[PDB]
Amino acid sequence: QWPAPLANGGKSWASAFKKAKATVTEMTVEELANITSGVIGLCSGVTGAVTRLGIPEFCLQDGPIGPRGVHGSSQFPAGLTVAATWDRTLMYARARGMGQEFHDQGVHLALAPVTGGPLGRTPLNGRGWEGTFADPYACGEASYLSVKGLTDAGVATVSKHWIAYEQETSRNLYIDIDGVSQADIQLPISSNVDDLTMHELYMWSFAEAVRAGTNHIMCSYNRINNTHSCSNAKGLNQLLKTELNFQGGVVSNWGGQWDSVPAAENGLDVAMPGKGFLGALGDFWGATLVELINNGTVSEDLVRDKAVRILTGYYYLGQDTNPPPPFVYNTIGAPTLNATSGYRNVRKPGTAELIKEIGSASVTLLKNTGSLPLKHPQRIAVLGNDATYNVLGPNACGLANSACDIDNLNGTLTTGGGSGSALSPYTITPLEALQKRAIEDNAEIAAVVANSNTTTGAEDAIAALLPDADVTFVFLNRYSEEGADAPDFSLGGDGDNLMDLAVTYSSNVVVVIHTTGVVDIEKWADNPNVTAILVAYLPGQEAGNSLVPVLYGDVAPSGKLPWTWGKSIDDYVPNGVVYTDAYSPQSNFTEGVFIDYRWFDKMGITPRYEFGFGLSYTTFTYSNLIVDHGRWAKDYSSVMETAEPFAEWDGTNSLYDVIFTVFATITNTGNLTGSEVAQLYISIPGDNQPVRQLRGFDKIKDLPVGDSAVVTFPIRRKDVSSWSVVDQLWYVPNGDFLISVGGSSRDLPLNTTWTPH
Amino acid sequence: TQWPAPLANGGKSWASAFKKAKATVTEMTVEELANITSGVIGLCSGVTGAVTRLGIPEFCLQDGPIGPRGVHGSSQFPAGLTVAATWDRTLMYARARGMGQEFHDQGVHLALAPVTGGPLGRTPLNGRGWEGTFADPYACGEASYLSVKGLTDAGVATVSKHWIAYEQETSRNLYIDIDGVSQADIQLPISSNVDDLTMHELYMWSFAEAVRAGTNHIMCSYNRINNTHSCSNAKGLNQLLKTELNFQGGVVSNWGGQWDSVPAAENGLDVAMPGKGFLGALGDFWGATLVELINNGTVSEDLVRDKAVRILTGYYYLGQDTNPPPPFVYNTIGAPTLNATSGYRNVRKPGTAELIKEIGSASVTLLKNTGSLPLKHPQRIAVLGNDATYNVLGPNACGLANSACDIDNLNGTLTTGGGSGSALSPYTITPLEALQKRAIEDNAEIAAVVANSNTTTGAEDAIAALLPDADVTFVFLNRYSEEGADAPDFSLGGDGDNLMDLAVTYSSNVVVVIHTTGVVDIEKWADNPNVTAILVAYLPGQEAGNSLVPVLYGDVAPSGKLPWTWGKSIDDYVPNGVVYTDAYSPQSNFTEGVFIDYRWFDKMGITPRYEFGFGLSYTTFTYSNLIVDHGRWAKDYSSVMETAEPFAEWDGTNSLYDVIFTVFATITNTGNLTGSEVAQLYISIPGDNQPVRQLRGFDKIKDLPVGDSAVVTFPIRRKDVSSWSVVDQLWYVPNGDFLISVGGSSRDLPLNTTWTPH
Ligand SMILES: *[C@@H]1O[C@H](CO)[C@@H](O[C@@H]2O[C@H](CO)[C@@H](O[C@@H]3O[C@H](CO[C@H]4O[C@H](CO)[C@@H](O)[C@H](O[C@H]5O[C@H](CO)[C@@H](O)[C@H](O)[C@@H]5O)[C@@H]4O)[C@@H](O)[C@H](O[C@@H]4O[C@H](CO)[C@@H](O)[C@H](O)[C@@H]4O[C@H]4O[C@H](CO)[C@@H](O)[C@H](O)[C@@H]4O)[C@@H]3O)[C@H](O)[C@H]2NC(C)=O)[C@H](O)[C@H]1NC(C)=O
Ligand SMILES: *[C@@H]1O[C@H](CO)[C@@H](O[C@@H]2O[C@H](CO)[C@@H](O[C@@H]3O[C@H](CO[C@H]4O[C@H](CO)[C@@H](O)[C@H](O[C@H]5O[C@H](CO)[C@@H](O)[C@H](O)[C@@H]5O)[C@@H]4O)[C@@H](O)[C@H](O[C@@H]4O[C@H](CO)[C@@H](O)[C@H](O)[C@@H]4O[C@H]4O[C@H](CO)[C@@H](O)[C@H](O)[C@@H]4O)[C@@H]3O)[C@H](O)[C@H]2NC(C)=O)[C@H](O)[C@H]1NC(C)=O
Ligand SMILES: *[C@@H]1O[C@H](CO)[C@@H](O[C@@H]2O[C@H](CO)[C@@H](O[C@H]3O[C@H](CO)[C@@H](O)[C@H](O[C@H]4O[C@H](CO)[C@@H](O)[C@H](O)[C@@H]4O[C@H]4O[C@H](CO)[C@@H](O)[C@H](O)[C@@H]4O[C@H]4O[C@H](CO)[C@@H](O)[C@H](O)[C@@H]4O)[C@@H]3O)[C@H](O)[C@H]2NC(C)=O)[C@H](O)[C@H]1NC(C)=O
Ligand SMILES: *[C@@H]1O[C@H](CO)[C@@H](O[C@@H]2O[C@H](CO)[C@@H](O[C@H]3O[C@H](CO)[C@@H](O)[C@H](O[C@H]4O[C@H](CO)[C@@H](O)[C@H](O)[C@@H]4O[C@H]4O[C@H](CO)[C@@H](O)[C@H](O)[C@@H]4O)[C@@H]3O)[C@H](O)[C@H]2NC(C)=O)[C@H](O)[C@H]1NC(C)=O
Ligand SMILES: *[C@@H]1O[C@H](CO)[C@@H](O[C@@H]2O[C@H](CO)[C@@H](O[C@@H]3O[C@H](CO)[C@@H](O)[C@H](O)[C@@H]3O)[C@H](O)[C@H]2NC(C)=O)[C@H](O)[C@H]1NC(C)=O
Ligand SMILES: *[C@@H]1O[C@H](CO)[C@@H](O[C@@H]2O[C@H](CO)[C@@H](O[C@@H]3O[C@H](CO)[C@@H](O)[C@H](O)[C@@H]3O)[C@H](O)[C@H]2NC(C)=O)[C@H](O)[C@H]1NC(C)=O
Ligand SMILES: *[C@@H]1O[C@H](CO)[C@@H](O)[C@H](O)[C@H]1NC(C)=O
Ligand SMILES: *[C@@H]1O[C@H](CO)[C@@H](O)[C@H](O)[C@H]1NC(C)=O
Ligand SMILES: *[C@@H]1O[C@H](CO)[C@@H](O)[C@H](O)[C@H]1NC(C)=O
Ligand SMILES: *[C@@H]1O[C@H](CO)[C@@H](O)[C@H](O)[C@H]1NC(C)=O
Ligand SMILES: *[C@@H]1O[C@H](CO)[C@@H](O)[C@H](O)[C@H]1NC(C)=O
Numbered sequence A: 001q002w003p004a005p006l007a008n009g010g011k012s013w014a015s016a017f018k019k020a021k022a023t024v025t026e027m028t029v030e031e032l033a034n035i036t037s038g039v040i041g042l043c044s045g046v047t048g049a050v051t052r053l054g055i056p057e058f059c060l061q062d063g064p065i066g067p068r069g070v071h072g073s074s075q076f077p078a079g080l081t082v083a084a085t086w087d088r089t090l091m092y093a094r095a096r097g098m099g100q101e102f103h104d105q106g107v108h109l110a111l112a113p114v115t116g117g118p119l120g121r122t123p124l125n126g127r128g129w130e131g132t133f134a135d136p137y138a139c140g141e142a143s144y145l146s147v148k149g150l151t152d153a154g155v156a157t158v159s160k161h162w163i164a165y166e167q168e169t170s171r172n173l174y175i176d177i178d179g180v181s182q183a184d185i186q187l188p189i190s191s192n193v194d195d196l197t198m199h200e201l202y203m204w205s206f207a208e209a210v211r212a213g214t215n216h217i218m219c220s221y222n223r224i225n226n227t228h229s230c231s232n233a234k235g236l237n238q239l240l241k242t243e244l245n246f247q248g249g250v251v252s253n254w255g256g257q258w259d260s261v262p263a264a265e266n267g268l269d270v271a272m273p274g275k276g277f278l279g280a281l282g283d284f285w286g287a288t289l290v291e292l293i294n295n296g297t298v299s300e301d302l303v304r305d306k307a308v309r310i311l312t313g314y315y316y317l318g319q320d321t322n323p324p325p326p327f328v329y330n331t332i333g334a335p336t337l338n339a340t341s342g343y344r345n346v347r348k349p350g351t352a353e354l355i356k357e358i359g360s361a362s363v364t365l366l367k368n369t370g371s372l373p374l375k376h377p378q379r380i381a382v383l384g385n386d387a388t389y390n391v392l393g394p395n396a397c398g399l400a401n402s403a404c405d406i407d408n409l410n411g412t413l414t415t416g417g418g419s420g421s422a423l424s425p426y427t428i429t430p431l432e433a434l435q436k437r438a439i440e441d442n443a444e445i446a447a448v449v450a451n452s453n454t455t456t457g458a459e460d461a462i463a464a465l466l467p468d469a470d471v472t473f474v475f476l477n478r479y480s481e482e483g484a485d486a487p488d489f490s491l492g493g494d495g496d497n498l499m500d501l502a503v504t505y506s507s508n509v510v511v512v513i514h515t516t517g518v519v520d521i522e523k524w525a526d527n528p529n530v531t532a533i534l535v536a537y538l539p540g541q542e543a544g545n546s547l548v549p550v551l552y553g554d555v556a557p558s559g560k561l562p563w564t565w566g567k568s569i570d571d572y573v574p575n576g577v578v579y580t581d582a583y584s585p586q587s588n589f590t591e592g593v594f595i596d597y598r599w600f601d602k603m604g605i606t607p608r609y610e611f612g613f614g615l616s617y618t619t620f621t622y623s624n625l626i627v628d629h630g631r632w633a634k635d636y637s638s639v640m641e642t643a644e645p646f647a648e649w650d651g652t653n654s655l656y657d658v659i660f661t662v663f664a665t666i667t668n669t670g671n672l673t674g675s676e677v678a679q680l681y682i683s684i685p686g687d688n689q690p691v692r693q694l695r696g697f698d699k700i701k702d703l704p705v706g707d708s709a710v711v712t713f714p715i716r717r718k719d720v721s722s723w724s725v726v727d728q729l730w731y732v733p734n735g736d737f738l739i740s741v742g743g744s745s746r747d748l749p750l751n752t753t754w755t756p757h
Numbered sequence B: 001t002q003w004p005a006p007l008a009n010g011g012k013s014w015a016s017a018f019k020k021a022k023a024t025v026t027e028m029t030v031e032e033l034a035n036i037t038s039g040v041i042g043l044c045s046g047v048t049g050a051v052t053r054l055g056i057p058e059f060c061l062q063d064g065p066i067g068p069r070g071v072h073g074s075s076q077f078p079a080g081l082t083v084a085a086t087w088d089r090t091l092m093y094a095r096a097r098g099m100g101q102e103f104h105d106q107g108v109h110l111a112l113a114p115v116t117g118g119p120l121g122r123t124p125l126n127g128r129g130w131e132g133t134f135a136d137p138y139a140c141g142e143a144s145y146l147s148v149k150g151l152t153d154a155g156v157a158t159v160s161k162h163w164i165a166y167e168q169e170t171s172r173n174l175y176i177d178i179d180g181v182s183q184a185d186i187q188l189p190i191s192s193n194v195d196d197l198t199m200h201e202l203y204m205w206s207f208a209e210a211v212r213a214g215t216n217h218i219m220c221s222y223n224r225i226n227n228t229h230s231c232s233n234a235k236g237l238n239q240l241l242k243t244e245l246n247f248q249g250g251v252v253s254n255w256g257g258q259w260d261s262v263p264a265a266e267n268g269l270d271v272a273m274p275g276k277g278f279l280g281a282l283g284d285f286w287g288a289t290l291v292e293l294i295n296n297g298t299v300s301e302d303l304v305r306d307k308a309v310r311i312l313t314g315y316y317y318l319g320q321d322t323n324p325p326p327p328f329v330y331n332t333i334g335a336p337t338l339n340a341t342s343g344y345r346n347v348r349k350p351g352t353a354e355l356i357k358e359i360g361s362a363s364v365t366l367l368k369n370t371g372s373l374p375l376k377h378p379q380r381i382a383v384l385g386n387d388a389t390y391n392v393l394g395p396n397a398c399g400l401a402n403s404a405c406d407i408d409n410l411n412g413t414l415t416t417g418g419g420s421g422s423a424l425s426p427y428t429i430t431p432l433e434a435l436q437k438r439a440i441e442d443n444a445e446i447a448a449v450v451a452n453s454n455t456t457t458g459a460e461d462a463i464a465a466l467l468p469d470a471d472v473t474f475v476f477l478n479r480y481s482e483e484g485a486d487a488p489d490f491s492l493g494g495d496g497d498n499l500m501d502l503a504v505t506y507s508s509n510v511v512v513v514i515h516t517t518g519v520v521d522i523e524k525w526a527d528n529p530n531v532t533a534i535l536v537a538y539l540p541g542q543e544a545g546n547s548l549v550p551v552l553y554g555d556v557a558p559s560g561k562l563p564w565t566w567g568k569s570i571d572d573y574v575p576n577g578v579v580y581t582d583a584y585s586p587q588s589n590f591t592e593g594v595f596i597d598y599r600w601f602d603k604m605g606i607t608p609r610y611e612f613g614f615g616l617s618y619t620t621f622t623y624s625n626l627i628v629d630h631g632r633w634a635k636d637y638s639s640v641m642e643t644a645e646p647f648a649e650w651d652g653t654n655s656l657y658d659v660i661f662t663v664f665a666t667i668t669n670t671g672n673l674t675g676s677e678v679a680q681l682y683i684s685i686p687g688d689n690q691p692v693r694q695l696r697g698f699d700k701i702k703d704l705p706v707g708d709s710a711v712v713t714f715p716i717r718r719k720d721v722s723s724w725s726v727v728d729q730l731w732y733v734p735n736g737d738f739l740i741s742v743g744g745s746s747r748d749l750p751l752n753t754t755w756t757p758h
C-alpha cells in the first residue's frame, strides 16, 4: 500500500551512497542475499561478506551502555542516569566514550542508542532504564547527542526500537525450535496508536536520531495496528523512509522478523540474527531470498536498495580505508557458539573520571530535612547489600546480567538486565567510598550487608548497631530486565524490611536508591526519622566514589528526575502493561499524547516528586523572563534532513529553524555554591492539549552565592507546532501560547503569553 | 603451711612506691583492706573497691592483650601471635606502647595483658594460643619483657598472665555457683602435673622476664598444678613466684579462678576478681567473708596488709595518684548482667594506623613460592573466600568478646580471635578493597566470590566461570578459635576445604593467604603445583588488606617467620596435648618435659612441613664467619626488677643475667632484590636428655641491599647456657661441649662451632 522510496544519500552521505551504489551494482543475487542476512560469528550479529569484492563481515554488537559481553572495557552509566544529569556535554561525552570502546573492540555497528522505544508510557517497563527521559523533547535531544557521540567515534549506530515498543510482556520474539513456533502460541502485543499520537510523541525522538545521522534503525517486537513492526509498510516505507526521509537501513530485532515476502516489500533491510542462534529466531531470507528473487516474486531492484542502505554506513564512516580491528570475544556463549575468546584492553585514561562525573551530576536529592550535607560524623552505620559487592562477583549474572538466582544479593545496582547491560572491571562500592571518607575523619563505620529477613542474627545486629550512630545510610535497589515488566513498584530483596528496622532504631536515616525506575517508599518518605532521600539510578562502575562527594557536600547535588514519581502505580496511564492469553494481544493507546507528566497534569493528580524535580544544598530565585523575537536562525547544523511536511514551507526554510529565543535569569539565593537545571515549558493552544510540554533546559554550573546567570532557550518552529491529522502536516496554531520557566515541571514562577502576530 | 608468704619490699625500681603504699595501708581498717582486695561492680572487666576515706579510687581492670576490649574509639591491634612472627623487638615494644596509650586514655589503671607464657604452646590446638607469642621460652620471654615494658611506659599497670602451666582450655572449668549448684559438684579443673625441671627450664622462663621488666601484677590460672588450684598453690605462688622470682607485685585471680577463701589468702592470692561483679556468680570468697576471717583470728591482718601493699605499689609507681586516668565510659560487661549506658571517647592518635599496618607487613610469612610472587601487573584477578571481605553482619557484630555470631556466619576477615583477648574495630580494610585499589592503578579487572561456596546457589558455577581466565587467583582462608574451647583438629574454618578444591581445579596460579589463630591442615593442596604460593598472615587487626597487598606486589619483601612448628599431622606433636574426660579430677601429665613444639620434633626425628623459624623472602641470604667473642661480656645493670634465682657461680657481685659472651655472624644478600632477614641462634646444652637445640638469640637485619653484608649479634647470658639441677635446686653452667648454631631457621643452620667452659 505504501511504496519503498529508493535511497539517495541525503545531505551528508552523498559520496558514501555513490560508492555504495557502485559496489551493489556489481553484485550477484547470491551476494545481495549474503549481505542482507546474518551469519555465524562472535558478535551479537554478523552480516555476510561479499568476498569477491573485498567487503567483509560487519560485526553488530550490543548495546546502549557500551559493548556487551566483552572484557577489557568499562561499565558506563545507563541512559536513565545520563538523562538525570540534564547535561548536554555529559550526554555527548558518554556516547563518544562508548564509541571509542566499541571501535577499539572492533564493532562496526553498535546496537545503540535507545532513542524513544521504549519512551515511557509505563513506568513498569523492564527496560525503560536503557532509554532516557519519559518526554519526547528531552529524549529527543539526548538521542541527538548520543548518536552524534557514537558516530563521531567511528561506529555506525542502530537507533532503537522503532516503534511504540512500550511493554516487555507479550513482546513474543519469533522462536522456532523442533518445528513448533511462537506463531502457534501467541502473536506479539499490538500497539494501536492513532496518527496524532504517533507524530507528536513516538516519532519525535526518532526524527532527532535521523537528523543526527543515525546510520540504521532497528524495528521492534510489537505489532502496530496488528501488523508486525518489521514488516509494517505504513511504519517503515511511509513514516520512516518517506516522511523522516531516512537514508539508512532497517535492522530486524533478534526474532523480530516473522515472514519472508512482506518484510522485503515493506521496508526491512537486514535480517538478524539469520543463521546465528542455530536459526531458532527465524531465518526467513538468505537462501530463501535467493529463491524469491530468481523465481520472480521479490524484485532485485528492491533488494539492491537494501544493500545500498547497508553499505552507505560502511563507506561514510571510512570502514573500508580504516577497518576496525578484529573482534575477539565469544559474546554468544556455548553451546550455541563453540569458540574461544581472545583478550583486549581498551579502557583509556579519562574514561573512569568521566563515569564518576556522570554519577555525581545525576544523583538526585528528593528529600532533605537538614541532615545533608554531612559534616564529619564520627559513628556511621550502613544497611543493605546494595552498599557492597555482588556476593558471587560483579559479573556473576553472566553475559546479559540476568542469570543469577531470584534471591541472590547482587550488590550495588550499577546496571539493569538484558541486551543493554555490560561487564564491569570492578565495582567501587558505596561502603568502600564511605569507609575511605570515615578514615580521613578518624571515624568508625560498620555495615550490615546480609539479607535482614533470612540471615540468622541480622535483625539483632541492626538493633545493636543503629541507636548509637550519628547517621545511618540505607542503600536500596530494584533490579529489572528486558523480557519482563516489573509487577509493581515494590523494592527489591529485603528493602522493605531494612526500612522498617532503620526507622525503628535511628533518627538520622539517609536513604540512597539504585534503581531502574520509580519505586514505592510511601511507608517511609514522610517518617521524620528519614531525614534524607537520594536516587542514584544506575551509575555504572563508579558507584561509591560518585555518590560520597555529594553526600559530604564537596559538590552540591544537581540531578533532577527524568520521569514522574507518583505515590501509586494507579496514578499513571491506564493499562500500562496488558496481561492476556488471547492469541492476538492488544494494547490500545487511548490516552493519546498524555503519558508520564502530561497524564498527571491533565488529570489533576499530584505526584510525590514531579518530572524535573531535584533539590540542591542552596536555593535559586527566577527573574526577568524575556521572549526575544529578534533572535532567530536557519537550521544549518544537522547531519541529515527529514521531509516532514509543514504549512509554512517556502522551499528553503525548515521545521527546525529557530523562530525565537527565550531568556531568564537565575540567582543563587541560599548559602552555598550550586548548579541548577532551568526548564522551559510551553502550553500550545488547541483542543485536548497537554497543560504544558517541556521545550527547553539549560544547566548552570557552580553559581556562587549571590551571583546571577542568564539561561537561554532557543525555540524551533516544531517546538510550537501541532500535527494536523486532516492536512497531514505540522502547523503553528493561532491562539495563546503560555511559556513558563522554572526549576521543575510544577515549580514555574516565570510565565508569559505569546500570540503569534 | 609449708611455704610461707614473703613480705613485699619494693625491690629495685619500686622502692619509694612501696614506701607510699605502706604509708597508706598502715592507716587502713580491716573493712578497707577487704574492700581493695576484692572486686566490686562497675563498667570494666573488674573494679577494686575504693578506700574512700584515704582518697583511693576504684581501680579499673580491663582486658586485654590486644588493647582495651568492649570499647569504641580505639584501634584493633594485631594479636601477640602476629607480632611474634615479625621477630622484631622494635615492633614488639611499639605495639605495646600504643595499646598502652589507648588503655590509659580510655581510663584504665590495670591492663589484663600481656600474655607471657600461659599458654606457651604444649598443644597447637589451644583455643587461645594466639593471645601469646612464640611456642618457645626464649622468644616468648623476650617478647613478654618488651610488652610489659611498653605497657608500663605508657602509664598502665600490667597484669601478666596466666601463671602457670595453663596449656589447655578444655576442662579449664571456671568456678561458677548459681541457683545453689556449683562447678565443684560437676568437675574440678584440669590438673597440669609438672616436674621441677620442666617448671624451671620451660614454663617459668617467660614469667621471670615479665618480672624483670616490672610487671606490676600477675594473674594466676584456671588449671590446678599437681592437684592444687593455681590461685591457692603455695609452692607456685609463695615459693616459686614470690621467693625465687622475688616478685614484688600483686597476684590477681582469674575470673572464676578462686575456689576458696582461706587457702587462697594464705598461699599467695592478693586480689579476688570479679567479686560482686557478674552477680557474684563466679565466686565471691573474700569481701565481708575476709573481714570475718580477720576479726575472728583465722587469717592474719598482716598477710592481708601485704596484699594491699602489693596492689597499691603499682598505683604509686605509675603515678596514678598525681596523674589519674580519666573516667572510664563504656559498659564492657553488657546487659542484662550490667544495665548501664555508655558514653563515647575517641583515643585513636595519628600514627597508630600506620604502626598496625607496619606490624602486618613485617609478620606475613611466605611459606611457598614457585615464581608467582611478587606480582608484576596482572590484568585479570580473581579472589575467593569471605575471608577477603567484611563480616556480613558488621565488624563488631560478634559482640563484646568476638564470640556471639552463629557457628555458620560469614565473619569476613579474621583480624582477631575470640574471647577476652579480642577487641572492637573502627573498620576493617579488607583484602579485596586493597587488591582492588592496586588493580585500578594497573587498569586491571578484579572480581571476588565471597559467599559460602557449599551453601549458596550458583556459587560453585561462578567460581568455575571466573577462575580459568584469571592471571592470578587469591584464595583467602581462615580458622577462628576462641577462649573456652580447644580446636578439635587442624581443619580450616567454613568452606575453606571446598574453596581449595575448586581453586586448584580451575586455576593454575593460586596464591593462598591464611588468617588464623594457629596451625591448620593444608596437606591436600600444599604440594599441588597450582598452589604457587602460600602466606600466613595470622591476625593482623584493622589494617588487614593494606598490610598484605604491598608484600604481594613486592613494594616490601616478606620477612616474617613462623613462631611455632607446622607439623604435617596432629599426630606428630606432644601426645595427650588435650585431655578429654568426664572424670571428677581430670589429669594432664606433662611427661614430655621440656620437649614441646620444635624440641619434640627434633628429639623424635620428625620432619615438619614448615619448621619453627621458617619464612621465605624474595631474595636469598648466605651466612658466614661465625665468631664467638669471649671477651665481650657485661654485667646486667638495666632490668627494672631483680629475681632471686639461685645459681652456683654467685660470688656476691654477679648475676644470672650477665652477658658472659657474645656471638657474631655475617649475612650477605645473595639474590636479586633488597630484603630483610631474621638471623637465629641455637645452642645444644650438654647433659642428660637435653633438647638437640634451643633458641637463644635472634636479630633482624632490615632492608639489606643486593650484594651487601651485615653483622648480626647475639648477646649470650649466663642463664642461656645453664640447666636446673633438681638435686641442688639451682641453676649452673654444665661441663662439656656446647654446640652453637646460627642460620635462617631451626633446620637451616649452616654455621656452627663448639664452646667448652673449663
Ligand atoms: C494505525 O491506525 C490508525 C487509526 O486508523 C491509523 O490513523 C490514521 O492515519 C491516517 C493516515 O495514514 C489518517 O488519514 C487522514 O485522514 C484525514 C481525515 O481525517 C478524518 O477522517 C476520519 C473520518 O472517519 C477520522 O478518523 C479522523 O479523526 C481523527 O482526528 C481528529 C483530529 O485530530 C480527531 O477529532 C478524532 O478523534 C480522530 O482522532 C479525521 O477527522 C484525511 O484528511 C487525510 O487526507 C489525505 O492525506 C493523504 C496523504 O498526504 C492524501 O492522499 C489525501 O489526498 C488527503 O489529503 C488531501 O486533503 C488535504 C486537505 O483536506 C490536503 O492538505 C492534502 O494535500 C490533500 O489534497 C488522511 O486520509 C487518519 O485520519 C488517521 N486516523 C486516526 C484516528 O488517527 C494510523 O496511521 C495507523 N498506523 C499505522 C502505523 O498503521
Ligand atoms: C609438682 O610435683 C612434682 C613432682 O613431685 C614436684 O617436683 C619436685 O620438686 C621438689 C622441690 O619442690 C624436688 O625436691 C628436691 O629433690 C631433690 C632430690 O632429687 C631426687 O629425689 C627424688 C627421689 O624420690 C626424685 O623425685 C628426683 O628425681 C627427679 O630428678 C632427677 C634429676 O634431674 C631425674 O633423673 C628424675 O627423672 C626425676 O625428675 C631426684 O632424683 C633434693 O636434693 C632437693 O634438695 C633440697 O632443697 C630444699 C629447698 O631449698 C632443702 O630443704 C633441702 O635440704 C635440699 O637442699 C639442700 O641441699 C642442697 C645440696 O644437696 C643445697 O644446694 C641446698 O641449698 C640445700 O642446702 C629437693 O628436696 C623434687 O626432686 C622434685 N621431683 C621431681 C620429679 O621433679 C613439683 O615441684 C610440684 N610442683 C608444684 C608447683 O607443686
Ligand atoms: C539479582 O539478579 C537476578 C538476575 O541476575 C534477579 O533474578 C531474576 O529476577 C527476575 C524478577 O526481577 C525474575 O523474573 C521472572 O520470574 C518468573 C520466572 O520463573 C516470571 O514470573 C517473571 O515473568 C512474568 O512476571 C511478570 C510480572 O507478573 C511479567 O511482566 C512477565 O511478562 C511474566 O509474566 C507472564 O507469565 C505469567 C504466566 O506464566 C502470566 O501471569 C503473565 O500474564 C505473563 O503472561 C505472558 O507471558 C507468558 C509466557 O512467559 C505467556 O504464556 C502468556 O500468554 C503471556 O504472553 C519474571 O521474568 C527472574 O526469573 C530472576 N532470574 C532468575 C534466573 O531467577 C534477582 O531477583 C536479583 N536479586 C534481587 C534481590 O533483586
Ligand atoms: C564466626 O564466628 C563465630 C563466633 O562469633 C563462630 O562460632 C563459634 O564457633 C566455635 C567453633 O570454633 C563454636 O565452638 C563450640 O561448638 C559447640 C557448641 O555447642 C561445642 O560442642 C564446642 O566445644 C566442644 O568441642 C571441642 C572439641 O570436641 C572441645 O575443646 C570443647 O571443650 C567442647 O567439648 C566438650 O564437650 C564434649 C561433650 O559434650 C566432650 O566430648 C569433651 O570432653 C569436652 O569436655 C565449641 O565450644 C561456637 O559455638 C560458635 N558459637 C556460636 C555462638 O554459635 C563461627 O564458627 C565463625 N564462623 C566461621 C565460618 O568460622
Ligand atoms: C557469504 O558470507 C560468508 C560469511 O561471511 C562468506 O564466507 C567467509 O568468507 C570470508 C572471506 O570474506 C572468510 O574469512 C577469511 O578466512 C581466512 C582464512 O580462513 C582469513 O585469513 C581472512 O582474514 C578472512 O577472515 C570466512 O572464513 C568465510 N566463512 C565461511 C563460513 O565460509 C561467503 O564467502 C559469502 N559468499 C559470497 C559469495 O561472498
Ligand atoms: C568500698 O567500695 C565501695 C565501692 O567502691 C565504696 O562506695 C563507692 O564509693 C565511691 C567513692 O570512693 C562512690 O563514688 C563516687 O560517686 C560520686 C557520685 O555519687 C561521684 O561524685 C564521685 O566522683 C565518685 O565516683 C560510689 O558512689 C560508691 N559506690 C557504692 C556502690 O556504694 C565504699 O566507700 C568502700 N568502702 C570503704 C569503707 O571505703
Ligand atoms: C518463489 O520461490 C519461493 C521460495 O522458496 C517459493 O516459496 C515461492 O512459492 C516461489 N514462487 C513461485 C511462483 O513458484
Ligand atoms: C524514630 O526513631 C526513634 C529512635 O531513635 C524511635 O524510637 C521512634 O519511634 C521513631 N519514630 C518513628 C515515627 O518511626
Ligand atoms: C481495544 O479497542 C477496541 C476499540 O474499539 C475495542 O473493541 C477493544 O476491546 C479494545 N481493547 C482490547 C484489549 O481489546
Ligand atoms: C571465722 O569466720 C569464718 C568466715 O565466716 C567462719 O566460716 C569460720 O568458721 C570462723 N572460724 C572460727 C574458728 O570461728
Ligand atoms: C591445575 O589447574 C588446571 C586448570 O588450569 C587443571 O586442569 C589441572 O588438573 C590442575 N592441576 C592439578 C595437579 O591439580
Ligand SMILES: *[C@@H]1O[C@H](CO)[C@@H](O)[C@H](O)[C@H]1NC(C)=O
Binding pocket: B193, B587, B589
Ligand atoms: C599421671 O602420673 C602418675 C605417675 O607418676 C600416674 O599415677 C597416673 O596414672 C598418670 N595419669 C594419667 C592419666 O596418665
Ligand SMILES: OC[C@@H](O)[C@H](O)[C@@H](O)CO
Binding pocket: A044, A062, A063, A111, A253, A254, A419, A482
Ligand atoms: O534482546 C532484545 C534486543 O533489542 C536484541 O534484539 C538485540 O541484541 C538488539 O538490541
Ligand SMILES: OC[C@H]1O[C@@H](O)[C@H](O)[C@H]1O
Binding pocket: B045, B063, B112, B162, B253, B254, B255, B420, B483
Ligand atoms: O583477663 C580476664 C580474663 O582472662 C581470662 O583468664 C578469663 O576469660 C578472664 O579471667
